[PDB]
From Swiss-Prot, chains A, B, C:
Naturally occurring in which organism (per UniProt): Homo sapiens (Human)
Cross-link (Glycyl lysine isopeptide (Lys-Gly) (interchain with G-Cter in SUMO2)), chain numbering: K527
Protein name per its UniProtKB record: 60 kDa heat shock protein, mitochondrial
Residues with the N6-acetyllysine modification: 51, 58, 63, 67, 101, 106, 109, 132, 167, 178, 181, 194, 212, 225-226, 245, 268, 290, 328, 335, 365, 372, 445, 457
Single GO BP term: T cell activation
EC number of this enzyme: 5.6.1.7
């Protein structure tokens, strides 16, 4: 329905390479310790300052249609790498540009670009096998700190903070990053159980130092349904008063009659009691209710299976907590007196539901439930002066967290781009089936030097000489661009997650090889 | 109402041929083993990379009205071939361009384009008869693998996967293609009966390894209507408890009372039971309910003809299954203990409804029902790195499946375009009625060489010499463009479905002959 | 309210003649056996390829207002001819152009265009009288086949198919043309009574070979109103069961209670029964119900005049059919055991309502009812490869059908344009009243040679010499442009319906004579 413009042969390839070169040239200035930042104008407000490869890649769109085709393909490379590994997007971008540029030169009348792509994929598989062969697992927390430091543009403090958080919540715990109102980064740990639901009526406050309600050795009444009637709340209060212990009432809500009874009894008698809304809004509400029931040790009133009416409440059906703190915003329970076997059984159940499928919203909830059950969560408040600084440092901290998680999962290799450099000899043991496969293998062999060359170039030195001296040295020696000298990378802590490297290489090679198999490009005539 | 532009004679033909030439030149670069891909810009997101003839054809629209008329006619050729045979669109496109170009040169003051078209169709009928004469049926699975490999651009793995799927589900089974999240292609076979309806309440889980419910030697209660009353569910539970066997309850839904009873009995007593919704939404729901009832062996409660009330449920009216697995997303029944004669009668019934008419939605459902009844379904998850790769490989896999189905239906002939080359002698035994019929026969004779010449040209060699050496050789010898030498096509497995070849030739000839009978072209003046 | 442009004298005539010449030049290339096709761009989809005069005429609109006035007048000529005779539109177009061009040259200061028009109309009346004098009726089916062959651009197969259909359904039967999904034309005859209403519930199927229900020697119950109550269906079933004969129940619909009873009895007892909806939606529903009742022999329950309640159904009030076949889509009744005198009386009634007036929807319905009552209908499924081919061949088949009907109505004359050529001597016996009448008679005399000249010119030969040799030959000799030699038209089967010829001549002359009486042309200034 719309008129089309068709281009053939080398002209379309030249325009697409122009687009790829522009996008990758913009991205590549942010690579390595001596990389610089990119300023991206935002339509609504203040501009963004970023050193992130995918953020720079996604913000570039070109007026020309063929240049935009090339730019969109490189954007796909960077976005796929970011989604899979969470880091290494600049490396993927520069690898993709190298592969596209090397493959466009090899297209001839007799060349077969599909067999060239087959050879490229074969070489990439060989290099990935070599990378997995030469990686080693992460054992000490010092390696975790070093990985987090390298991924955060050489910030020692960020790496130390991430290492401390992983030590205190586990290598596979829940760590969140949020902006901070202070000037320095802060790490806070939420232990026990804590949910963002405060007391309903500010009449149960008995401390007033921070407008909070603390109870020690308290009873817990968890109800699936709302508590509104007098008969549904009186027996629990009777048991609490007979046992002379404070009572926390966690429910969806407390309606007028029961709430009025609670406030009147608290004000007149002085009975210790507090009411809290139930965290969650759907099935998650029931799941967290059951989780708190197991952690404290008791029962949930109003379940569709048990249907335990509140009238027949018993002293043994109320949970016990060592301490409960209720603030206007959030409620927190510590030292639930529940049996440990049931808690471990629930944890095993949750990890089993963690391995059925994904829904983009559920596995995060299961991980949060496990963190609340077992070891708490860590929160990194990123400090800064203005919003742009906080956003830049937040991107760096997120990159460091993703890289540390990848290193925990799969291990580490040499940093600085030397991991791919050491895989060049693995490509000399291959026997290409035909000439086009040999061309593809040579393309990958030439591409493997690109990350180290780019890192050296950003440092102001000649990349070719640096790469040659790296390859002529021993296998444990690489180049420190920050210091500017040849060192032992493992000793100095310049290490990279092997998952990041292999993901970047695979995505870049896969997309650029398919790009270099084109002969005709069809675009839309620019009506507007 | 709109002003028109009228063109006469050779000028209109020249413009229409310009459009045809442009579209076919874009399409023809993707022909044969050494063909290349075409990049098509998408308005919404990432561009498409395709080697498919119809996909490239449908994406080309021209600003000029006469060129667009030619382009639309060639699009009709490619689309008709794709709809009929599912493959051979590039061959049809190049044949159509050849016929149009050869027929435009023969138009003279004394020439009769209608008689030329009559001669063209006569020659095409003769060539189709010769093609049917020289075809042979497919007998061994190796031929199936070879056809699937050739149609998938020479991918051995795709051909092997398709051959395995056809072996394990039958040559006329149900094979589906979907994208995969992994890097490699995978083939999964669904046996027995399986529908995408999981358990209603996650309280019947008794395994917890994968959050699934397994029952062995279970009773099955299938109800057409919803189960809501206590009286409509109690007797079935009574029979199941007396016989001490688990019970699956497949229905449209289970409302509050019956569901609450089921969960209460499962939680307290521990009675084995599970509830599943009914697959389908209209008449298909009833059809599949009857199918599962026949497969397991029992009755459907709530039918408009039988009206078997759930209250009078009997032990002999409940189906028996060797094993049932209910997962949160889907339910699966294996080893239904139903009589085989009734199953065969139902299968015959369904194949009979397969042969009444078509409705664009129904025969697929009947085929799915047969697959569920008899041999299961096969699913090919196509692996790749990015979405563009998966889409390209998915187009190739779909082409391979269509070609394999056509080869099973009608047989095979020599590949590489030699099947049409061997039909040239059949046109020398014709006696044209007049001069125009002779012109048409010569047009078809010259056109028959086009596919082989195009395949050879895409390989970087001279097509004319290759075709001459093919014609001067023995009938079993042709040209391997991938290897680049003259071989035995049947021995090397370069074979084509005869249905694809005859469909492409027929559609191309039919449309191009009618195109070449024009003297006046009327278009709309480009107001916008 | 809108500014106008006024033109006087010969300039306006020149512009109008330019428009007429353009439209008629586009139309005239499609005339005769050696005519070519015209491609018309369609806004929505694929372009049209047509050899039809009116289709080409209606698709031409010109930017210039005076040229568009001329084009609109020629469009009126072609549309009137198509509406009246269904064929001969190209002949009318060329005749109109000839008359306009010849009359524009004769306009002088002293000439009287109104008297010229009077002379033209007088000459046309004389020529029409001569044409009626020299025509002969159609007697043998071979002449029918020849007329259908000539009108279908010399397609023998189309003529044979039309002749067979006319033989098997009558020369004045109902023949419909629809597209076919096959490659070849097919003729299917629907006998007896058949309506597009299948069974309601697919539970009465007792054959399963084609999912159909066959009954032999069946009872028929026709009800004007819906059957919903038990008492309105039980007595008919009782009569059918006592007489042990199957029962077809034709009504508007069968509601829940009666339908449930029917399915229950069919499933359990095995009683032979079937239910079918009533064809039609308004008064036509009642008319066809009465027709079916008369054909089978019985009564309609629920008429506003008889009001025969279903409760008092009698064995003599149910129709008898030799055989009834009910499929999913349509129902068919054969060998109704009704008295023949009533059937003939009903047929006479319907032919009498055929001759009262027209409503653009009713006489077609009456003809359909007669065809269902007496001799059935014929359906021509036109085969082709693509939609454009099917549309072109469908236009040809419709033209052939219209010409065959006209030949049956009024007779035949010599084809090839010789019928008008033989009427030239009839214009030499006229005595013009004045000079302007003589001018008009000479205009018609010169115009009478135009169809033969155009047919000869399209064949690539000199039209003037061909026409001269035709006029110098004997009255039975004409020119075969397809063969290209002088032959006997009646012997060779080159004949034309006299109605078509006289309609074309009358329409063209009438419009062009009025066009040539203009002195001032007023158009709208082109604001947009
Ligand atoms: N001090 C250093 N000396 C040499 N190379 C370094 C140093 N610090 C980091 N690198 C290298 O720089 C790369 C990180 O660059 P970065 O901007 O994060 O790109 P990406 O986003 O692709 O990871 C890593 O591969 C790492 O090996
Ligand atoms: N190795 C080969 N050598 C020679 N010809 C081949 C080879 N592989 C495939 N072909 C030919 O190439 C054609 C396939 O081209 P393709 O791009 O699929 O066009 P289409 O879409 O029209 O089928 C087939 O007709 C086949 O005969
Ligand atoms: N074989 C033939 N030789 C000579 N004249 C023919 C032949 N076949 C058809 N004709 C003439 O050609 C005319 C048909 O032209 P056609 O394209 O149908 O124009 P129209 O639509 O005005 O009838 C008829 O009048 C017929 O007499
Ligand atoms: F540029 Be990446 F996100 F380290
Ligand atoms: F181009 Be076809 F779909 F093989
Ligand atoms: F051009 Be006509 F309709 F034969
Ligand atoms: K970066
Ligand atoms: K192709
Ligand atoms: K015509
Ligand atoms: Mg990084
Ligand atoms: Mg193919
Ligand atoms: Mg005609």
């Amino acid at each position: 329905g719309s008129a089309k413009d068709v281009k053939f042969g080398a002209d379309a390839r030249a325009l697409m390479l122009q687009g790829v070169d522009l996008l990758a040239d913009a991205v590549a200035v942010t690579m390595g310790p001596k990389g610089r930042t990119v300023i991206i104008e935002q339509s609504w407000g203040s501009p963004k300052v970023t050193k992130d490869g995918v953020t720079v890649a996604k913000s570039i769109d070109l007026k020309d249609k063929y240049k935009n085709i090339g730019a969109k393909l490189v954007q796909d490379v960077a976005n796929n790498t970011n989604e899979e590994a969470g880091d290494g997007t600049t490396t993927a971008t520069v690898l993709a540009r190298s592969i596209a540029k090397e493959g466009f030169e090899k297209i001839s009348k007799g060349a077969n670009p599909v067999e060239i792509r087959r050879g490229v994929m074969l070489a990439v598989d060989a290099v990935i096998a070599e990378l997995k062969k030469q990686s080693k697992p992460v054992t000490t927390p010092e390696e975790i700190a070093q990985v987090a430091t390298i991924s955060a543009n050489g910030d020692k403090e960020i790496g130390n903070i991430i290492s401390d958080a992983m030590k205190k919540v586990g290598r596979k715990g829940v760590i969140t990053v949020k902006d901070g109102k202070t000037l320095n980064d802060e790490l806070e740990i939420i232990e026990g159980m804590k949910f963002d639901r405060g007391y309903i009526s500010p009449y149960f406050i008995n401390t007033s130092k921070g407008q909070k309600c603390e109870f020690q050795d308290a009873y817990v009444l968890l109800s699936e349904k709302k508590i509104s009637s007098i008969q549904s709340i009186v027996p629990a209060l009777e048991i609490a008063n007979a046992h002379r212990k404070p009572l926390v009432i966690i429910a969806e809500d407390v309606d007028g009659e029961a709430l009025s009874t609670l406030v009147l009894n608290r004000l007149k008698v002085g009975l210790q009691v507090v009411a809290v809304k139930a965290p969650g809004f759907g099935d998650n509400r029931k799941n967290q209710l059951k989780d708190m029931a197991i952690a404290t040790g008791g029962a949930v009133f109003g379940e569709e299976g048990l249907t335990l009416n509140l009238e027949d409440v018993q002293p043994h059906d109320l949970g016990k907590v060592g301490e409960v703190i209720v603030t206007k915003d959030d409620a927190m329970l510590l030292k639930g007196k529940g049996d440990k076997a049931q808690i471990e059984k629930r944890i095993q159940e949750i990890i089993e539901q963690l391995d059925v499928t994904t829904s983009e919203y559920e596995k995060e909830k299961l991980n949060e439930r496990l963190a609340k059950l077992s070891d708490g969560v860590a929160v990194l408040k990123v400090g800064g002066t203005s919003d742009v600084e906080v956003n830049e440092k937040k991107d760096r901290v997120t990159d460091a967290l993703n890289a540390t998680r990848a290193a925990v999962e799969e291990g580490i290799v040499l940093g600085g781009g030397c991991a791919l450099l050491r895989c060049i000899p693995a490509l000399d043991s291959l026997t290409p089936a035909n000439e086009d496969q040999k061309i593809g293998i040579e393309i990958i062999k030439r591409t493997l030097k690109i990350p180290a060359m780019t890192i050296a170039k950003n440092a102001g030195v000649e990349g070719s000489l640096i790469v040659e001296k790296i390859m002529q040295s021993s296998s444990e020696v690489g180049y420190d661009a920050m210091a500017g000298d040849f060192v032992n990378m493992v000793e100095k802590g310049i290490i990279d997650p092997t998952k990041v490297v292999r993901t970047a290489l695979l995505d870049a090679a896969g997309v650029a090889s398919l790009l270099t198999t084109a002969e005709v490009v069809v675009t839309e005539i620019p009506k507007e």
